[PDB]
Amino acid sequence: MKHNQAVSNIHFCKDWRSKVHTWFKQPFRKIRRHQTRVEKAKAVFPATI
Amino acid sequence: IKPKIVKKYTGHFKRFDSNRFLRVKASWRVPRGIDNRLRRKFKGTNLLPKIGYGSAKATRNMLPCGLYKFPVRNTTDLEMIMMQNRKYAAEISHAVSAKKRQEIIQRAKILNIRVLNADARIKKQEVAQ
């Protein structure tokens, strides 16, 4: 450390590379849930309440 | 009318040690070595590109004919410099075919535009033709 800075507290000393979760499935969770909601809307028809 | 073009140095600033090693090309590079003979400007080896060699602003980028180079690709690009035929000279690009080169050369005669590639890609009509 040099000059004026905050004291750094970063918990990367472990293996974070195997702890990384990526949200590439986020755009397809929306499609999966919405489609399941629509099939839920039928079957129990009316009042999928 | 044509101004006198003055070149402060007509030689090439060849890279240091390019005359001794085939891996070192001749394109210029600044010697950054701590002990380098050239960057210290020793006597004998004291030739580096400086802004002081810059040519005059009036005649910079001027062709020996006294005009400027304007690259053209078809007959429409000639119309961009028809109003400045005393300043610009046409220059057909290297990839333009021989057929389109005839139209550019023919149209430039009509518009009185000088072409510097007027003898390029001429057909077999040199000997007995």
Binding site: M1, K2, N4, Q5, V7, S8 | R32
Partner: protein, 148 residues
């Protein structure tokens, strides 16, 4: 944008702007906040003089929701209902209707008294009141109401 980095302007310079005497080696005094009491003590004294030590009593399990108490000054009370409502009841007094400023509804629990109040009676309803907050509200002709 990696074309605007300094690495593109230091191509050809041997050491990439890190010096020839003191190279760009792996470490420059340790890893993390190492040597905070031995050789980086001048850094911790200069910039974080109370880093090392203890102060105060431990709270084994802190209930930070008990210390939640948003505050609003008296000068900021009328902005909760807007200037339009403020001018509507500008000439109100004792006897007729006076707008009620429910701070809890807006997320403010305690009313502190800082700045000035427009000279109109107002009913301020909140959970806690500062001492000067009640004085300033009463001096303007208003009333203080408690909640919860």
């Amino acid at each position: 944008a990696t074309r605007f980095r300094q690495t593109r302007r230091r191509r050809g310079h041997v050491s990439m702007g890190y010096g020839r005497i003191g190279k760009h080696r792996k470490q420059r005094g340790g890893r993390g906040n190492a040597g905070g009491q031995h050789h980086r003590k001048t850094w911790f004294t200069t910039f974080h003089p109370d880093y090392f030590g203890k102060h105060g009593m431990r709270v084994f399990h802190l209930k930070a929701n008990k210390y939640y108490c948003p505050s609003i000054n008296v000068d900021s009370l009328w902005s909760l209902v807007g200037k339009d409502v403020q001018a509507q009841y500008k000439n109100a007094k004792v006897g007729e209707e006076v707008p009620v400023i429910d701070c809890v509804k807006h997320g403010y629990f305690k009313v502190l008294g800082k700045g000035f109040l427009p000279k109109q009676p107002v009913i301020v309803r909140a959970r806690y009141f500062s001492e000067k907050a009640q004085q300033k509200i009463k001096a303007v002709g208003g009333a203080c109401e408690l909640t919860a």
